[PDB]
A = this chain, B = another copy of it.
Amino acid sequence: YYDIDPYKEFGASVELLSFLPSDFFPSIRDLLDTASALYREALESPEHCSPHHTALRQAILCWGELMNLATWVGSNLEGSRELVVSYVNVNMGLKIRQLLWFHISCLTFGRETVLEYLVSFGVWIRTPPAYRPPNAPILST
**Interface of A toward B, CB cutoff 8 Å:** 1-2, 4, 6, 8-9, 13, 15-16, 19, 21, 23-24, 26-27, 30-38, 40, 43, 46-47, 51, 53-55, 57-62, 64-65, 68-69, 72-73, 77-79, 83-84, 87-88, 91-92, 95, 108, 116, 119-120, 122-124, 126-128, 130-141
Contacts and interface: CB of A to CB of B under 8 A. Distances in A.
Contacts of A108: 119, 123
23 contacts: A1-B35, A1-B64, A4-B43, A4-B61, A6-B58, A8-B46, A15-B40, A16-B38, A19-B33, A19-B37, A23-B128, A26-B126, A27-B126, A34-B122, A58-B58, A58-B62, A72-B87, A77-B79, A116-B141, A120-B140, A131-B136, A133-B138, A136-B136
Number of this chain's copies in the assembly equals: 6
A131 B24 contact: yes
B46 A9 contact: yes
Q: Closest 4 CB pairs between A and B? A: A30-B126, A9-B46, A62-B62, A133-B138
Contacts of A21: 131
A36 to B, nearest CB: 5
A109 B129 CA distance: 20
B37 A16 contact: yes
B131 A134 contact: no
